[PDB]
Amino acid sequence: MGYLHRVVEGLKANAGGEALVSADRRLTGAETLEEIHRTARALAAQGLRPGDGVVTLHGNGVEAVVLRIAVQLLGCRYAGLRPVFATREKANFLAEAEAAAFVYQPDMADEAAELLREVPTPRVLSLGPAPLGEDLVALAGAQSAEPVEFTADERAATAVGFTGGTAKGVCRAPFDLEACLDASLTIFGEGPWRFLVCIPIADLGGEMAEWTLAAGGTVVLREDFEPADILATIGAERTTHVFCAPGWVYQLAEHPALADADLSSLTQIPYGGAPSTPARIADALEKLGRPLLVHCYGSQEGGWMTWLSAEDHVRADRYLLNSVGKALPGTEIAIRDQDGADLPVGTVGEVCVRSTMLMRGYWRLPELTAKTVRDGWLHTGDLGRLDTEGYLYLVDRAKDVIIVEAYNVYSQEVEHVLTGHPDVRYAAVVGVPDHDTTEAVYAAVVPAEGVGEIDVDELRALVRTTLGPVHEPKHLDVVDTIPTTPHPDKSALRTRWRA
Ligand SMILES: Nc1ncnc2c1ncn2[C@@H]1O[C@H](CO)[C@@H](O)[C@H]1O
């Protein structure tokens, strides 16, 4: 239909229902559409035309979703900066963006000043009253809400998400965005949803909000994940979905307030983005008490690639918690060797994917794009193996593989064996220098609750008799905690091992 057409049709289908809900503001579908139309006119009145870059700096307010959609309705290129990014990383993105405008949240004017000092930008605009540039919400306030039709090229990029790559802005056009929408309906089920987005509107949260609106639903916004707030919100706002990082799942399931929370409105807790720990997902199932969990494997480059359904989490005759599920309709998966050759089902190699959800490409990085997408196939930089039912099992990121005297030890697979043991809650496996074998296998393991001394020889034996001898951790370190990224922090583990 056209992506922005899909979004607007959803909002019209929900004209009298709630569409954008935060702690501070609640808009109906019709109200949301009006704000979009008038914000779009305000932006066009500032001189913005199709293909103009619009860089933003905001949190997850209603104003932010409105802005994101309005920018794209014009056919401009939305480039959202995450607040969490370092100021210097922000400047770099801003410099690279060829920005025709910079739109910032008033709250954040200090940092906006730093950035614009580094990278002077025309059309500085604020989401409300603020020191720098003009007040976009004021300007939108005073335009007509007469509809603005999308007339730009469905194929030209309207959004740039920062944090692809295995820095990197990932360009997305309406075409690939609509395909992502269609896939989300397969994963999340038919709309309307009441979808708790606590992920940045700057990128993935913003996409999920778009899809929610497009399928006729309500976006329930939070700035970030805090388990007590989320448990309360699910009940108070009657959410059908909340998209989680795997660790968030475990925090919900283990929280003391879970008993008192009302989860009855949930249809799903879709999760992914980082490797799950199967045994911890198994505990979460039990604690939640019904098949809510849906495992989602995707990337900014690839869109949605596979999903494991809620019912496949509890399939009677299989155990699939170490799988990321099966291909989305329309998605082809090939598992390839180092030379690019397709491997028979069952073999480990690089996960490569072809679908209409593929990104347009990396913003201004043509060499890397041609390296990453070859003959229409995304090379994910993940390693894995399919089975005869079509389930995909990720065994490593290519960069994490540990080479022990010419043998390949897949760190995530070893981790799953360790965490599978009842004594082990969490594990991280990394390679360290070895005089004899070049690399040796190092594992850090966090004991489970009610576990005393880990039997390290038991753990080595389990790995040995599941994967084979070379997969065994030579070095096995009991730790209190596994360091994290802003994924588990494998470089940090590698470093702390020397000392
Ligand atoms: N559900 C998931 N399970 C494991 N790793 C994932 C999942 N979703 C995303 N990833 C990882 O993060 C990357 C996305 O930027 C993937 O290519 C993959 O390595």
Residue numbers in the entry: 1 to 166, 170 to 489, 492 to 504
Extract from the study:
Amide Bond Synthetases (ABSs) actively catalyze both the ATP-dependent adenylation of carboxylic acid substrates and their subsequent amidation using an amine nucleophile, both within the active site of the enzyme, enabling the use of only a small excess of the amine partner. In this report, we describe the activity and specificity of an ABS from Streptoalloteichus hindustanus (ShABS), with a broader, complementary substrate spectrum to that of McbA that includes enantioselective behavior toward an expanded range of acid and amine partners in amidation reactions. The requirement for large excesses of amine in these reactions has prompted investigations into the ATP-dependent amide bond synthetase (ABS) class of enzymes, also members of the larger ANL (acyl-CoA synthetase–non-ribosomal peptide synthase–luciferase) family of adenylase enzymes, as these catalyze both the formation of the adenylate and the amidation reaction within one active site of the enzyme and require only one or low equivalents of the amine as a coupling partner. In common with other adenylases, McbA features a larger N-terminal domain coupled to a C-terminal “cap” domain.
In order to explore the basis for the broader substrate specificity of ShABS, the three-dimensional structure was determined by using X-ray crystallography (SI Section 4). As crystals of wild-type ShABS were initially not forthcoming, two mutants, K492A and K492H, of a lysine residue K492 implicated in interacting with ATP were prepared and subjected to crystallization trials, in an attempt to obtain a structure. Although no crystals were obtained in the presence of ATP or AMP and acid substrate, the inclusion of the noncleavable ATP analogue α,β-methylene adenosine 5′-triphosphate (AMP-CPP) was successful in giving diffracting crystals of ShABS K492H in the P21 space group, from which were obtained data sets that were refined to 2.01 (Data set #1) and 2.57 Ångstrom (Data set #2) resolution, the second of which contained density for AMP-CPP in the active site. This structure of ShABS (ShABSAdFigure 1a) featured two molecules in the asymmetric unit cell, each of which corresponded to the “adenylation” conformation of McbA, with an rmsd between the two enzymes of 1.50 Å over 469 C-α atoms. The major differences in active site residues between the ShABSAd and McbAAd acid binding sites were W307 (ShABS) for F301 (McbA), W214 for C209, R175 for H170, C299 for N293, and S302 for T296. The presence of the two tryptophan residues is most likely to account for the differences in acid specificity between McbA and ShABS.
